[PDB]
Amino acid sequence: VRSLNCTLRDSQQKSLVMSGPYELKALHLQGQDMEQQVVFSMSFVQGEESNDKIPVALGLKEKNLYLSCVLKDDKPTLQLESVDPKNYPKKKMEKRFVFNKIEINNKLEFESAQFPNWYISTSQAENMPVFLGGTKGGQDITDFTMQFVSS
């Protein structure tokens, strides 16, 4: 399986960082303070692809931790999950871990492969958790930019 390291920034220029062991938060960060920003290892997995839709898995660079989508209280929820450090990543990643990376005019959107039309979203306010939102349209942010970082 092929990967690439990168950071994501929401369309409002908020950066993502590790809240506790299993949460991500988005805040406006600038300076050497930028160092506290999570670096993902984006893997190109198997699934349904288009010129526009590419299935990926998002893990933390060097941590056996992956974003996954699961129901919690009858609603799709984004969480960080630990995986056996020896079996991952894989090309055929379980569905809960797959997002469709959609390119939309220089911006990306990450939709859950498991919950159609649920996207990785951030809040307009500072310091709130990154979550799975089912609505696109003026409120929560569902678009990001990506920056390549080195291997």
The separation between CA 67 and the C-alpha centre of its own chain, rounded to angstroms, equals 6
Q: What is the CA radius of gyration of the chain?
A: 14
Domain range list for the chain: 1-151
The fold for domain 1-151 equals: Trefoil (Acidic Fibroblast Growth Factor, subunit A) (2.80.10)
Q: What is the DSSP-derived secondary structure letter of residue 94?
A: -
User: Quick one: CA dihedral 30, 35, 38, 39, positive or negative?
Assistant: positive
Token pair listed for 46: 């198997």
Dihedrals φ, ψ of 64, to 5°? Answer: -80, 60
* DSSP single-letter state for residue 6: E
Reported as half-sphere exposure (CB side, CA atoms, 13 A), residue 59 has a value of 21
Which of 10, 5, 3, 4 shows the shortest CA–CA distance to 24?
Answer: 10
Using CA atoms, how far residue 9 sits from 25, 43, 95, 139, in Å, is 11, 18, 24, 17
Angle, CA of 117, 44 and 90, to the nearest 5°? 110
